[PDB]
Design a protein around this ligand. Structure first.
Ligand SMILES: NC(=O)c1ccc[n+]([C@@H]2O[C@H](COP(=O)([O-])OP(=O)(O)OC[C@H]3O[C@@H](n4cnc5c(N)ncnc54)[C@H](O)[C@@H]3O)[C@@H](O)[C@H]2O)c1
Ligand SMILES: NC(=O)c1ccc[n+]([C@@H]2O[C@H](COP(=O)([O-])OP(=O)(O)OC[C@H]3O[C@@H](n4cnc5c(N)ncnc54)[C@H](O)[C@@H]3O)[C@@H](O)[C@H]2O)c1
Ligand SMILES: NC(=O)c1ccc[n+]([C@@H]2O[C@H](COP(=O)([O-])OP(=O)(O)OC[C@H]3O[C@@H](n4cnc5c(N)ncnc54)[C@H](O)[C@@H]3O)[C@@H](O)[C@H]2O)c1
Ligand SMILES: NC(=O)c1ccc[n+]([C@@H]2O[C@H](COP(=O)([O-])OP(=O)(O)OC[C@H]3O[C@@H](n4cnc5c(N)ncnc54)[C@H](O)[C@@H]3O)[C@@H](O)[C@H]2O)c1
Ligand SMILES: N#CCNC(=O)OCc1ccccc1
Ligand SMILES: Nc1ncnc2[nH]cnc12
Ligand SMILES: [K+]
Lengths: 462, 464, 460, 461
């Protein structure tokens, strides 16, 4: 009643978003269990959280969990295509500041982040940061150092964001401590792998409705995202080849039943067209990038790809594919939103019945979020239960209030303790109806653990 | 070959030529191990090394032994399981003039005697200076019974999850006398051997022991660590309906996402000791139970009493006490079908009816079923583990821990893993053995993700 | 041109873009265009068509038109139309009456609009049907029109069953080709198509994670086999129900547990017959039978809270949706997704936890909540449709003497050689390379180098 | 003093009996027939010549036929497929059996002759059970007078059925036959799932090779090729499939396999130049599944990747050109039914030569040659069909019919669908599955009887 501190595509989508939020709550037992567990204690009372992460239905349940535990938030998406407008509307209609819509320009994207940082044209009294990819974190360090003075910590969602934090720590420019939410096992080995298993072929089907069975796929990378992506395609019947620079991950791809290939002859990428294995790329129907790296689907690869192959990226940033080359040289025909035909016959105009094109999804942005709805609620449950625990821990540490000498001892990038990782996992398992066995005292003694855990040494890889 | 060679004990020396044929095949399946032979033979990095080895005397172990020998070492060898030896492997090694004391179907007395034959030479302790172990039994005998021999030993290289746990317990208690390398926790060991090895060899052993159809039947896998993961896949890929038990909620979460139903043998997961806590309806529909935990009594007497008639029971963890076979020896009549396959008749202890329908089938008497009823992991998988073993031996032997003063010794008494760079190089040779082609980072790409073009490519915290 | 009714004609450009893509995914169908365009085998044909107005059906329509036919088209399901496909077809001057989200009355009206042109019966002479509704209407309401029609080509299992019942009863008036039982239709479309589109529609409707959850698939025919695989490949724990013990045997061997909703499989009408413990653990039930009431009122009452219920058989009476309309309160989440509150009939609590999620109001879920089978699968089905239309039209049954008609009134299938020729074009679409027998090899197994390679009894 | 047999070692009988008793518990359809028909004795007076792999599973089939009243004289239909403990148990039961693992071609022939002749004269046979048609062929060629008194043939396998159909075409088939192969509880159980179980089984037993990550080429994608492809893919092999039948190739593509031909553009013209050398040089394992001749030929064998495994799971060994390899290359036995073929020449070999192939079972049926064939619970379906087929033809008494009535009954038929369904039901109950019963309204709605059959005869499953 009188609330205008937001900007979304269409506020009238709020009732629809609320119905989906109520469904999503029943799919997120770990997150909803934290709501019940900590509601009375109000551990986030006084927290003022700047949030930058895909404004999906799942992020909506996270936001309302943080608010239910006492926090105030100002929110934006971390990607121009990842917002679900009904989710953003439901949040704005709850009186929560959110600046996000599907299909933002790059200028609107930066504007939205700035609207969370500033309130009434001045720095909001923020004291916590929740980030996904590091864009909000970077803007605060470069443009608002005075705000970081009063911020107790950053909780970072994803592999790329964590790498940017560690680079800051290395160079001595990180100003506040952070929790690496990515490397909880109930995040990295749930979200990053199983989420892409669910949502990759989902996005491809919604964007193209292509049959995948019997066709040839090339997955660039075999980390957590590349493992889930390769399984997403293989389980549909694709013939999947895997490329990697890490021989250990390549070993896993071989033992997992994939043929390991390189886009470059003998894997040497010397920048020439002669280095391209034209015969291999000429047979690929679908290429997916999963690396977090730069230019792993390059211009010479794009020139050599089979006619009408689908090109997409599920890493965090669109620079995995040389889309800039494609904008400079090839004509773009929009099929529908986030689906473009790229005509390799020239830059000026195209023949509507030309057969020499590629199909680009989400203009190279995160394809699961751009062309579908990203990961499902029951997977994001794990990641976002970790987020809430990480927020609680850093806000209770109160780094911004410590003496300079104590700040120096706590300026670090840490992960959550394994006991909490296990506690999130148990709620997830109970959500499936799974029944964990309890050790007897003798069994716990035999393997050297407490009956209640943790059950593995910190070196354990699962 | 040495004239008059008698310093061995095997089942049947006439199997030697057959064993040699299989070793030559296995060499073509083990490019990382054979690459270490070619690369290091001239330098002789193990010259002067005198290695006590205790690990399953398979064809794959034969290639490992002859690699150590080719790099300059002398060895004296036993198996770390009474059923895991391949008799043609042991014969080929003995025929090559290498002291080996190992055969399939040892008694427990014979098993202990075999280890002692490696420790002793001509009635007196051998002047060993290196130890290679799998499960910790030889490590334990040396510490317990021959502690003075440990004064000359530079290191232990331990193969498997259970052995590493025993070493860590010793280290924390101040009873470990020499440094050790945890070979198990190389990624090219743990996440290759322990998982993929069991995927290959669990259904292999069950087929060879029973020739049972697995498709369409119900399986319960106890444990979902690396071995439990590999075991569950071995059975699911055959078409079994697989249920998974775990005490670790993170591993249970993985089982759920992997498409398994997670269940407990005990109502609400609580074993209160009584029969009333057994989920009898669940156990009464299980056709196959596999233990994978490295823990004790995870398939207990009450579970065995409740299992569906004619269910198969087996253990693929390191030690047989995962199943309470002692209870079954005490109370039920055992009918040998063929070696390492027993029908266990739940009608009573004394006799059994030849046509009784109420029995279970126990494989390998509860010992590691993949090595007991088949041949364990395949050569191309053991290549990774045993390349790590060779590199661990070279590193510790060149360190010369036993030659340091007591002060410097306290500084290096540790249990270490091999560095990731070496893990990656082992993996690269494995990938090349499949004909896989690894891509090389450009300089700009390596700078972008903060790695060297030559690796390592991941931080030490990375879990793969 | 105004002889059409669609949801939004301005979607036509979008529809045309997706048709141009679809043509690249349908090599058997496009090969028929190139090879028969010269002959124009369908010149003078006037086809009444009733099949899901999808992008895939658009390529079928334009193939028939390319070969000389005129058509008047409707969808065979109220939720299966893709509005951009209907628009593109209407914009090309082809009469079509079809939109997504028709009422039952509008569905009947749409078919009537193909049958009638300017208030009078169109001079149709061919029928292309999917499920038999159009066939039924012509026989019951417009029987004199059937005197000019040379044949019916029927797409799907349910519709073929209806054709055979009329044949047995002596009420079928024109010959028909059973398109369903070409191998490149039944064992491509019915199975592999549902494998692609079932989990697709469930994700689009609910965005639920499927890995780790319990599914019950009722039926294990071709649709049940594909549906079960759609779910198992996602990591669902899939149980299968069947009344056919051979199909049940296949489910066991395929690695599924075979269960019945009823104790000992005996459905005696009582709630006591329901296996409440089994149904209380099921997160998703999918009906695939073509039978009636295989997910009945007592099962719906026993289902786990918040289970998803859906049907991928042809008709929406596989689930007792009428029971739910009469007794429980429906809350629309979004189009074709309803929460069904088991707390009562009049009103519901927005936060009630005791509900079921019904997809597409019990109608064909793959077409209702997604886009049905992909173009490359529908290629096989629709190539058979074209060949069957050519064959029946050139036989000219309506022009035969009465004695010649009696010998010609049957339900037949396409010869295996044509089935194999369709398959070869599909294989080449994947880049597959079929080996050619040597003369000695052909003689050794008793086939021609040209094929057919299997006897008509072979089951593949 | 029973001596009317020949087996490898009669002292293996007790071990064989232990395994028969287990197999009985794995074969509920077959044991169900045993219990249902024992008192009626429907095979009393039946005297069966049987020629089929002398496995434990065949042992249960034999003793079921005997339990229902039949007398039999048995041989194996393959030189490597007998399980010697199974043969010993049968012999020790007083049942004439002539079979051991590792026969020569001469011994194979002699064993079939020992079933046909008793005490030097033709046995008073009146039924035939065959697998592959060798016994059927010997009777037609050499013992026509015996066929005058024989009521029928029940033939197990695709290749044997093809040979029956050629005889029927040519007017040379002398007695009616039941095609047991084309029951759904046989062809789409045994041929497919049986090879799924036992192909990777035999390869592991023969070589202990890791299969995950390696490249396989399966020739054919019928029932056996489908099961064989799954056997390898589920182990993590990268599987390519070859086919001449584009419908079967279509299935392979849709099932997620790349379909390739050993020959460029699929044209097998007999030249080395027509071989896809790049493809063949990548293959670690080739498996033939066709029932055809020379589908893994000499030019394919010359082009294969060094140390590739070569094997055949079709009925006969001429699917691979082993004759070429015997004539040109040096054979090194690794162990029984495993040979390295050194492509360096014929006159000897280097023990450390790297250029060899591994051939399993000398090109004979690999699942039976290098392991134990299909598991009991799968053979349960095939062999329940065999028992029912024997009962049906023996009760028809074709040999006693007048000449005009023989003409009307001389045919190759399959068992009716109702029997096929009842077999399947016992298999399903053996898994603990629960089949649902149609209501009367539901049976009326789909036009079937509540008890079945549930499908028209044209249904393909
Ligand atoms: N879309 C999603 O839902 C989602 C979810 C989680 C993470 N992500 C993003 O996906 C990316 C990957 O995440 P991750 O957790 O899998 O990281 P990771 O470190 O586990 O894996 C990335 C892999 O890429 C490989 N790689 C790097 N450069 C390569 C090259 N040139 N060619 C081939 N392979 C190469 C690396 O060897 C590594 O194994 C990150 O940007 C992350 O933020 C996206
Ligand atoms: N047979 C082989 O070839 C082979 C190979 C490698 C290791 N192993 C042996 O297998 C065993 C397991 O090794 P690993 O690497 O998988 O270890 P691991 O630690 O990775 O996994 C063991 C798992 O068992 C679970 N567990 C423990 N007690 C349990 C109980 N009561 N109920 C259910 N689950 C329980 C633990 O939570 C753990 O996840 C060890 O003894 C190891 O030496 C055998
Ligand atoms: N949605 C689609 O895209 C699509 C595609 C093809 C066919 N269909 C439709 O799907 C239905 C099934 O087609 P099909 O080709 O699989 O037919 P089918 O005859 O091969 O399979 C139906 C199966 O249901 C089983 N069944 C019957 N009553 C049952 C009951 N009470 N409980 C359990 N199982 C029962 C039958 O035994 C049979 O195996 C038909 O209505 C057909 O028109 C839909
Ligand atoms: N080993 C076993 O346990 C076992 C079991 C059943 C059958 N068999 C035997 O296996 C063989 C195949 O039986 P089936 O039931 O699969 O028969 P099938 O007719 O179903 O399939 C054989 C396939 O081979 C294909 N083919 C023929 N020539 C080819 C060539 N040159 N290249 C590629 N593909 C070619 C055919 O198109 C056909 O699809 C027969 O000899 C049969 O008796 C063996
Ligand atoms: N009593 C008794 C045994 N009867 C039974 O189990 O059924 C026998 C049977 C098997 C296979 C097909 C048809 C009948
Ligand atoms: N185990 C077996 N016994 C008899 N015939 C078979 N054919 C295939 N496997 C068989
Ligand atoms: K989602």
């Amino acid at each position: 009643a009188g609330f205008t501190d937001y900007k979304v595509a269409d506020i009238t989508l709020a009732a629809w978003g609320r119905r989906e939020l109520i469904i999503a709550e029943s799919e997120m037992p770990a997150l909803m269990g934290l709501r019940r567990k900590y509601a009375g204690q109000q551990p986030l009372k006084g927290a003022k959280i700047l949030g930058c992460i895909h404004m999906t239905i799942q992020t909506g349940v996270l936001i309302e969990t943080l608010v239910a535990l006492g926090a105030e938030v100002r929110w934006s998406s971390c990607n121009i295509f990842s917002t679900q407008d009904q989710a953003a509307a439901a949040i704005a209609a709850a009186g929560i500041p959110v600046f996000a819509w599907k299909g933002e320009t790059e200028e609107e994207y930066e504007w939205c982040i700035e609207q969370t940082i500033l309130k009434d044209g001045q720095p909001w009294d923020a004291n916590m940061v929740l980030d996904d990819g590091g864009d909000l974190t970077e803007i605060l360090h470069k443009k608002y150092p005075q705000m970081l003075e009063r911020i107790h910590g950053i909780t970072e969602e994803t592999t790329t964001g964590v790498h940017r934090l560690l680079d800051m720590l290395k160079n001595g420019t990180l100003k506040v401590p952070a929790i690496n939410v990515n490397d909880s096992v109930t995040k990295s080995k749930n979200d990053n792998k199983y989420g892409c298993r669910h949502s990759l072929n989902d996005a491809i089907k919604r964007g193209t409705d292509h049959l995948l069975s019997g066709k040839q796929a090339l997955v660039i990378g075999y980390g957590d995202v590349g493992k889930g992506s390769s399984q997403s395609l293989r389980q549909e019947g694709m013939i999947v080849k895997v490329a990697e620079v890490d021989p250990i991950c390549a070993m896993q791809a071989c033992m997992d039943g994939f043929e390991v290939v390189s886009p470059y002859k003998n894997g040497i990428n010397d920048g020439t067209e002669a280095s391209i294995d034209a015969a291999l790329l000429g047979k690929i129907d679908l290429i997916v990038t999963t690396t977090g790296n730069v230019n792993v689907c390059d211009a010479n690869m794009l020139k050599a790809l089979k006619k009408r192959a689908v090109v997409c990226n599920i890493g965090h940033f669109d620079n995995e594919i040389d889309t800039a080359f494609m904008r400079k040289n090839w004509a773009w025909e929009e099929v529908k939103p986030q689906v473009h035909k790229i005509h390799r016959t020239g830059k000026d105009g195209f023949d509507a019945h030309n057969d020499d094109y590629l199909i680009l999804l989400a203009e190279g942005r995160l394809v699961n979020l751009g062309n579908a709805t990203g990961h499902p609620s029951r997977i994001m449950d794990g990641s976002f239960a970790n987020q809430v625990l990480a927020q609680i821990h850093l806000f209770e540490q109160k780094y911004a209030d410590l003496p300079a000498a104590e700040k120096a001892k706590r300026l670090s990038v840490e992960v959550l303790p394994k006991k909490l990782d296990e506690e999130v996992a148990l709620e997830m398992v109970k959500g499936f109806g799974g029944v964990v066995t309890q050790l007897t005292p003798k069994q716990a003694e035999y393997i050297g653990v407490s009956v209640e855990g943790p059950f593995k040494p910190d070196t354990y890889r699962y």
